[PDB]
Design a protein around this ligand. Structure first.
Ligand SMILES: Nc1ncnc2c1ncn2[C@@H]1O[C@H](COP(=O)(O)OP(=O)(O)OP(=O)(O)O)[C@@H](O)[C@H]1O
Ligand SMILES: Nc1ncnc2c1ncn2[C@@H]1O[C@H](COP(=O)(O)OP(=O)(O)O)[C@@H](O)[C@H]1O
Ligand SMILES: Nc1ncnc2c1ncn2[C@@H]1O[C@H](COP(=O)(O)OP(=O)(O)O)[C@@H](O)[C@H]1O
Ligand SMILES: [Mg+2]
Ligand SMILES: [Mg+2]
Lengths: 467, 493, 89, 464
């Protein structure tokens, strides 16, 4: 009652089955590569029923060495991953195989990686602020405990460094479980994260699921589902708060688009699969907090070619409670974290939750920065002196504010050699309120660059000679 | 009885051989209680879109035809309930008593079956009510980039309908329908919570098509909402339908069409996407008195990217609708909130959708704002500017500060009339800009506290009478005497 | 990316145009009654009128380029979409 | 000899016929939807011959409820619309069915909407000017008889009043009729126009043809041809000078693009249909003057992204002779019609056609108005007194000229009791020649609002 391979084109395999033995959609099939140098067991996910008892499947492993007409065994179920507290402190691939200890977890309970999202009735909005200690994030992009957080940005703007910073600032003191999903990222980054978590003794509370960018598209598409399944087990069965880090979520979409044409789908705009939004919605709606069960999800979102209008990030935007868009311009100015304060948002940045003072200070900062952005070109061409006295004062205030929004992060010590700093929310609000009132116009703008709070500001000012 | 066989299935589509008598758009029953819609018909098979649980579809399964095109239950029981595009509750509050059923593709009222839009639909937003008035039976687009306050505007309108609902007179009540397409489920929950806090769920129905739903549900949700609203519209009631947002419906329909191998056009959209949206939005009409005089007002939302209103779907929807409210993130960050761009936003219905008092007070607002936009560049050289243009710039600044509005705080039409009266009659010229807003609010409170007869006259007569105007000016002067500025100075004279 | 850069340059040139026009009018007023003078050191009303006209020309050229790029992007996108569809035909 | 449906993919339907009964291209076939909720009669237009006796057709109505194998009857001719004096004062769709009275016009003569343009010899080689009687239109932007006029105007600018005025003027002065073609017409706006024309009594002088936005692309593409066929019958078989309004022509282009995409043709540049220029020429070339009778057209044109190099407007403007732009600025100042003299234009404003004196006076008026518009910013900001005495007198003269380009239109008799006026071209030319010479500066500006000829100017002068 087993099938056989009929067609092979890269990561897509056609398999023919006897009548009545056609596997169900998403079932995991096993095929054997017997070549000496590449012997292995391909896991194939049934993607389409082609008719005539043929099924099109995506290979999780490379198909090099595969031979037409070889035995294909139907497991009768979707790809499953181990679940339970035993996963904590170990590294797994998209298929649930343990990397740091091969064969580990084979006896645990196994959950199918394909699941439905929680019922609309169970869903309940979350509005508690999550204090991080970064000035820009705390002020302009407050994070939600149990909510969905994203770090948008092009390549090399600071998404991964910010993810590590949030792991340091949130996961270290977390009282619950953490799940990290490295979706189609660099293997070196995975090893670095593993070693870092081991050093900080936080690995024992963290479960790592890695699918790297050198793996076939199938692994990159299903690794996020595997990690989300582990997180869902922790949320629903253990009933404990869960931290879920995903980096990079866009890799899921990219892998989905890689096999789209090979699956017979006609391309949508920007060469994306027609089911871009549908797959994104399924995956993102599985990532959520239910009534009484909290998942704090932080996702790094790659923006292709710094183009925020790209269909992938544009579709992703709708699934987030708080967004921090990292900008290439801010990055190139030397401001770190390279957050674009004008493009960032938070569903809880209104007076009802964060309070009147926080909202007022944030809105004044945003207004000053917007006006400075407007005057950027006039300054560039005609020079500052041609602005009005009020405009010049606003420009100086905005330069100092944008420098002050920068900070020395703990995860950035290896890049600047400067130890990181943390700023309490109240100090941040007070300092930015003072800045928007011109209380620090006398200090040089360089005094506001890559510092912590007001004490660090005074120290740097006196180092430069100001007071 | 005709039974078809599933010959293939992939990512939401299933081809079914057989059913030679199946209709186009007919609903089909796949095993396990799965539902599909026959969209492609040809000599070989029937390509149907699965409405949910596509993974349960397998080759060789038996498919039965329902004999009926897509239809949804409709009745008064849907008020305050959250349902999916099939009319089934998803809020876990039990069954819904359906008065009857309506096909989702019933033709819209003809040219002869309508009458000119003549009744205001107060959104409670000063900017919209004064600059781009919306009448009952009108289709007003709300177009802008993400996080510009479009959902805020629509929710404020729905909340504002509460007093009209409480009046109890069916000629004043407005039944609200909110359609959420491709939205995060918790976002729909937040919208429902906001409506509930304002007592709006007593007259509001939510058609929810969360992002996790099949492309079929995202494609059909606006039509389900339209049918639910139509059932009330044809029975003499007045309806306000909000689509949040049509861009996601267009994307879902494009996905469906591409998966069906239909020829793509610009932006990969099929050749009838404009037809999709026009068919959806032409059902929002103002029926003639012979048909009960009911109406349905459409408030479609469009999310542009990089403020590109020349894109395909935005262009189509702008062409279809009777007016547009353009929301810009630059104004939003400047503090202008709601961030409606009065320069480009237009309502082709115009003054016909305003009460007499609002039309009178708001006549000069357009000219003042345009002139202020012209004079913006000279704010640094007030001395150089002549007296007329200097006072003109100041008046424009006060007016721009006046149209600002906090979220979830709709204003009654009389309150809007009084506020715009303050703005356009020089009663804000003696106030600092930063205080204008505060002043406004306080003054309104004062008028409610002791001089409600002004509001009563405006509401019942729809006109600010001469004696009412004099009393309002007197109250304004007394309040100015009693008013305290933020800088500590005086505002009298 | 070129379309976004062109749009940014268009808005920059527009802001330059309004500021130069305001300077021209203020200079006219002052005449009736810093280095933005045209060639006095090598008048400000003349220089600002010239700058505003140059900004108008630059805006028109940038708008033409942006419209060309918009049409080209639409055509290329349709080319890729139809190429994929034909390949799958 | 009746066919049967084989494929149904949205508004595209494949129909099989016996071997020798395959319909010709563009033939109108009839199918039936029997489902009670959506019961109707589908009109299909043969678009392609697929071979093996299969024809691909575009449905003029939504195909919901259509079943495979249902009988499809062939009418033997393409879409035919009623013609004659009976269609005046009624509303029809692209298929000729009367909307204000179903069944009306079924007994009239029916003309196929697909017709060739006038033969080469029939075309009049000499371009002729159409005297509308409006001062601004006649002077600055003279309309071409049998020509095409682009119309531009925002909301609340008097566009519909201008259309109404043109309808009345063509009905009275030239003894002609009017045909309105609402391509992509909004049902609300169509009803509004119907009611307005009925109220103003000009409905009797016009035939309305609405292809609405809720209809599939085929009707939105063929409604313009239907209206043009009615106008062609009026011009040819009845010897009338017809006036054909089209709103919006870009929507005709967009419907053509949608139909092309539906039929599977590869899009051309910017995603338009490959035969964009051919379709636009086929529609526009039928709007010509022939045998002493003309069809003059005023077409509302939408420019995507305000890009006149876009293929749709670029092709449309190849067939346009004049251009009238209505402005909110001119409307605000009370000038009616709210035509923008500086922005508007006309291809026939050259001495070879309008004569030396006409061109000279028009150019002088344009120069004065442009100079005043240049002054406008200084006047607004620095104040009027800043201007020199020569600038002051030029401002006053230009303001008087701008007011005198206004006029009490005939269609304005409803909004104001004042009846309209018809200013002969010679009178307008001499009056504006006098104005540019300063011969009316002593008179107040008020004297120049909404009047006709020089006699009206004098009368209103003594009235003040
Ligand atoms: N009038 C207002 N004053 C202040 N804040 C406002 C106002 N209107 C909306 N906001 C805030 O602006 C943010 C965006 O608003 P909203 O989500 O309603 O807009 P949107 O454009 O529909 O958003 P999205 O991209 O989520 O669809 C939210 O924080 C909302 O609270
Ligand atoms: N806080 C910071 N201080 C200094 N440099 C930083 C900081 N954050 C990020 N960077 C720089 O940004 C680059 C990209 O970092 P990373 O986040 O790993 O890539 P990506 O942003 O693509 O995920 C690094 O080379 C690093 O030098
Ligand atoms: N000659 C005129 N006299 C007075 N009012 C006019 C005149 N022409 C146009 N208007 C005004 O212009 C407005 C718009 O008119 P119309 O063109 O009919 O509708 P639309 O605004 O849809 O173009 C009307 O409210 C009308 O009062
Ligand atoms: Mg990274
Ligand atoms: Mg929204």
């Amino acid at each position: 009652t087993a099938g056989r391979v009929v067609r092979i084109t890269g990561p897509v395999v056609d398999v023919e089955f006897p009548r009545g033995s056609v596997p169900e959609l998403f079932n995991a099939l096993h095929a054997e590569i017997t070549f000496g140098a590449l012997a292995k067991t391909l896991t194939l996910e049934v993607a389409q029923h082609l008719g005539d008892s043929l099924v099109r499947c995506i290979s999780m492993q490379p198909t090099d060495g595969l031979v037409r007409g070889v035995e294909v065994t139907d497991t009768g179920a979707s790809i499953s991953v181990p679940v339970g507290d035993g996963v904590k402190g170990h590294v797994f691939n998209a298929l649930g195989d343990c990397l740091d200890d091969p064969g580990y977890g084979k006896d645990f309970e196994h959950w199918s990686i394909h699941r439905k999202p929680p019922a609309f009735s169970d869903l309940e909005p979350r509005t508690e602020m999550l204090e991080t200690g970064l000035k820009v994030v705390d002020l302009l992009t407050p994070y939600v405990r149990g909510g969905k957080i994203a770090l948008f940005g092009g390549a090399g703007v600071g998404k991964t460094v910010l993810i590590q910073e949030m792991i340091n600032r949130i996961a270290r003191n977390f009282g619950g479980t953490s799940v990290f999903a490295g979706v189609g990222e660099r293997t070196r980054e995975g090893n670095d994260l593993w070693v870092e978590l081991a050093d900080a003794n936080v690995l024992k509370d963290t479960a790592l699921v890695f699918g790297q960018m050198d793996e076939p598209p199938g692994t990159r598409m299903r690794v996020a589902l595997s990690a989300l399944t582990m997180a869902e087990f922790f949320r629903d069965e253990q009933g404990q708060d869960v931290l879920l880090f995903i980096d990079n979520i866009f890799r899921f979409t990219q892998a989905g688009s890689e096999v789209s044409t090979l699956l017979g789908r006609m391309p949508s705009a920007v060469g994306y699969q027609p089911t871009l939004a549908d797959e994104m919605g399924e995956l993102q709606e599985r990532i959520t907090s239910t009534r009484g069960r909290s998942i704090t999800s932080m996702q790094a979102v790659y923006v292709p070619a710094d183009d925020y209008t790209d269909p992938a990030p544009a579709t992703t935007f709708a699934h987030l409670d708080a967004t921090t868009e990292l900008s290439r311009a801010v990055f190139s100015k030397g401001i770190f974290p390279a957050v674009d304060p004008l493009a960032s948002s938070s569903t809880i940045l209104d007076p009802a939750i964060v309070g009147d003072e926080h909202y007022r200070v944030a809105q004044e900062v945003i207004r000053i920065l917007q006006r400075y952005k407007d005057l950027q070109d006039i300054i560039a061409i005609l020079g500052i002196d041609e602005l009005s006295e009020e405009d010049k004062q606003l420009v100086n205030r905005a330069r100092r504010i944008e420098r002050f929004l920068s900070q020395n992060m703990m995860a950035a010590e290896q890049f600047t050699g400067q130890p990181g700093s943390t700023v309490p929310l109240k100090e941040t609000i007070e300092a930015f309120d003072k800045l928007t009132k011109g209380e620090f116009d006398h200090l040089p703008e360089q005094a506001f660059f890559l510092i912590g709070g007001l004490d660090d500001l005074a120290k740097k000012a006196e180092s430069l000679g100001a007071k | 009885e005709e039974i078809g066989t599933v010959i293939d299935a992939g990512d939401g589509i299933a081809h079914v051989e057989g059913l030679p008598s199946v209709m186009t758009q007919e609903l089909l029953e796949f095993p396990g209680g799965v539902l599909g819609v026959a969209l492609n018909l040809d000599e070989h098979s029937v390509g149907a879109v699965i409405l949910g649980e596509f993974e349960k579809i397998e080759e060789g399964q038996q498919v039965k035809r329902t004999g009926e095109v897509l239809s949804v239950p409709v009745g008064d029981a849907f008020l305050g309930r959250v349902v999916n595009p099939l009319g089934q509750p998803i809020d876990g509050q039990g069954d819904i008593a359906a008065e009857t059923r309506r096909a989702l593709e019933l033709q819209a009222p003809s040219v002869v079956q309508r009458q000119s839009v003549s009744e205001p639909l107060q959104t409670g937003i000063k900017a919209i009510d004064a600059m781009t008035p919306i009448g009952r039976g009108q289709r007003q687009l709300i177009i802008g980039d993400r996080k510009t306050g479009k959902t805020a505007v629509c929710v404020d309108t729905i909340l504002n309908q509460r007093e009209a609902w409480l009046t109890g007179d069916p000629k004043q009540q407005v039944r609200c329908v909110y359609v959420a397409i491709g939205q995060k489920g918790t976002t729909i929950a937040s919208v429902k919570r906001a409506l509930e806090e304002g007592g709006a769920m007593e007259y509001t129905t939510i058609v929810a098509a969360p992002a996790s739903d099949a492309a079929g549900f995202k494609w059909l949700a606006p039509y389900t909402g339209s049918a639910i609203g139509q059932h009330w519209m044809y029975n003499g009631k007045h309806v306000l339908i909000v689509f949040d947002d049509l861009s996601k419906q267009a994307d879902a329909y494009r996905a469906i069409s591409l998966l069906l191998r239909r020829p793509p056009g610009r932006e990969a959209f099929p050749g009838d996407v404009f037809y999709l949206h026009s068919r959806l939005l032409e059902r929002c009409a103002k029926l003639s008195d012979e048909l009960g005089g009911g109406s349905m007002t459409g408030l479609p939302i469009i999310e542009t990217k990089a403020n590109d209103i020349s894109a395909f779907i935005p262009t189509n929807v702008i062409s279809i609708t009777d007016g547009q409210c353009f929301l810009e993130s630059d104004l939003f960050n400047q503090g202008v909130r709601p961030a409606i761009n009065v320069g480009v936003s237009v309502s082709r219905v115009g003054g016909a959708a305003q009460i007499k008092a609002m039309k009178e007070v708001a006549g000069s607002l357009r000219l003042d704002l345009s002139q202020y936009r012209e004079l913006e560049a000279f704010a640094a050289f007030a001395s150089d500017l002549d007296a007329a243009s200097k006072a003109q710039l100041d008046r424009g600044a006060r007016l721009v500060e006046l149209l600002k509005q906090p979220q979830y705080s709709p204003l009654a039409v009389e309150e809007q009339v009084v506020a715009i009266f303050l703005g356009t009659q020089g009663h804000l010229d003696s106030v600092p800009v930063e205080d204008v807003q505060r002043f406004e609010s306080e003054l309104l409170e004062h008028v409610k506290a002791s001089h409600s007869d002004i509001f009563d006259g405006i509401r019942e007569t729809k006109k600010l009478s001469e004696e009412a105007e004099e009393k309002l000016v007197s109250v304004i002067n007394e309040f100015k005497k009693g008013f305290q500025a933020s800088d500590g100075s005086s505002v009298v004279v | 990316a070129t379309l976004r850069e062109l749009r940014g340059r268009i808005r920059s040139a527009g802001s330059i145009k309004k500021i130069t026009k305001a300077q021209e009018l203020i200079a006219t007023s002052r005449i009736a009654k810093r280095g933005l003078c045209g060639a006095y050191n090598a008048s400000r009303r003349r220089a600002m009128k010239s700058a505003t006209d140059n900004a108008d020309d630059l805006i028109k050229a940038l708008t033409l380029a942006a419209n060309r790029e918009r049409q080209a992007q639409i055509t290329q996108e349709i080319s890729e979409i139809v190429g994929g569809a034909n390949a799958l035909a």
